[PDB]
Amino acid sequence: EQREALLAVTIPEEKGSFLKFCQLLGGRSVTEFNYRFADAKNACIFVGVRLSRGLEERKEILQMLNDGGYSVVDLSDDEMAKLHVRYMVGGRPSHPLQERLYSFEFPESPGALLRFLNTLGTYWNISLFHYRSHGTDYGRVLAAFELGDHEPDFETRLNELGYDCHDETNNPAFRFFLAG
Amino acid sequence: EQREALLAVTIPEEKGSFLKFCQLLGGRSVTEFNYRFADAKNACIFVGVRLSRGLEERKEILQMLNDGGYSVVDLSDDEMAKLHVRYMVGGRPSHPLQERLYSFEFPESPGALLRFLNTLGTYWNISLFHYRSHGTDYGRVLAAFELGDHEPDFETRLNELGYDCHDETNNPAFRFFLAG
Ligand SMILES: CC[C@H](C)[C@H](N)C(=O)O
Ligand SMILES: CC[C@H](C)[C@H](N)C(=O)O
């Protein structure tokens, strides 16, 4: 019956961590991810999952995450998550960051988001990540990459690969609400 | 044609400010508000508005806010606001707060949210506010109130008035994602 799981997952706050977490979720129909840098050691990920086998599948995913070494809080029956908090996760980082923001899109197919994430390169730390794909023929990603000794320059390479990459660092909605 | 405005408004970060701002918006069909304490002097409000007269009404609201002394950035045509940022506003406060969180609900009628806000009392500073009402027979509010010399105690009074008030301070979704 229930068609959506809402999950609060802790993953380590380190480069490559999100990719490893998404690899464990590979067989599942994730429809939302949301993250912003907050705690220096442990990152918090909001996950929305489309279910086809209801509570059986919800329990499988919870068990898989625990067996894989991730902590998860199940928010699937949490009225505040359903009515409010699923629209409020993320916000501003815990301190000001030097970061470059990009948007991307791709047609949905099995594994499409994971193939996209593998192209980014774990050299870059991710300081903001939002994905949404609800039945829409295209998945949508907004992600910020933290500057190190140099800045990321993704547009040409990612456009070549079909991912419709745009620099959003000066986007007014980002600047007004999410910047540090 | 266009049926929704998305607005980024600056209001002063002081007690009673949100009520004054909502009073100016009184004749409009607001469907979303989202705010979290961030800057000490100027608060940022995300507003979603249902339109029945399209761009004419969008322009009326923008002009009304400027004429009333509020700064507004129009995000109604901003693709990042539409696809991403409208799900990411709010987050954690800029520093840790002593605050009590409550949820409320009421049947929608003209002016219902404003009648509700007048009952709260501008004695309390609001440090988190989320409202959503999209065609649903009931409007939904989640709000945090900052502690001073004593703590707020709203349940009995607000339940008497019909507002279905619950203390959400220990809600798992709030604790995991939005707490300071
Ligand atoms: C979600 C991002 C995670 C926490 C990490 N910053 C990464 O780059 O993989
Ligand atoms: C949105 C809340 C505003 C900024 C103020 N803190 C108030 O209590 O009215």
Curated annotation (Swiss-Prot), chains A, B:
How is this protein induced? Constitutively expressed.
| Natural source organism | Escherichia coli (strain K12)
Q: Say what the protein does.
A: Catalyzes the anaerobic formation of alpha-ketobutyrate and ammonia from threonine in a two-step reaction. The first step involved a dehydration of threonine and a production of enamine intermediates (aminocrotonate), which tautomerizes to its imine form (iminobutyrate). Both intermediates are unstable and short-lived. The second step is the nonenzymatic hydrolysis of the enamine/imine intermediates to form 2-ketobutyrate and free ammonia. In the low water environment of the cell, the second step is accelerated by RidA.
On assembly, the entry states: Homotetramer.
Q: Where is the ACT-like domain?
A: 5-77, 100-170
Spell out the family assignment given in the record's similarity comment. Belongs to the serine/threonine dehydratase family.
**This chain belongs to which protein, by name?**
L-threonine dehydratase biosynthetic IlvA
* Spans through the membrane: none
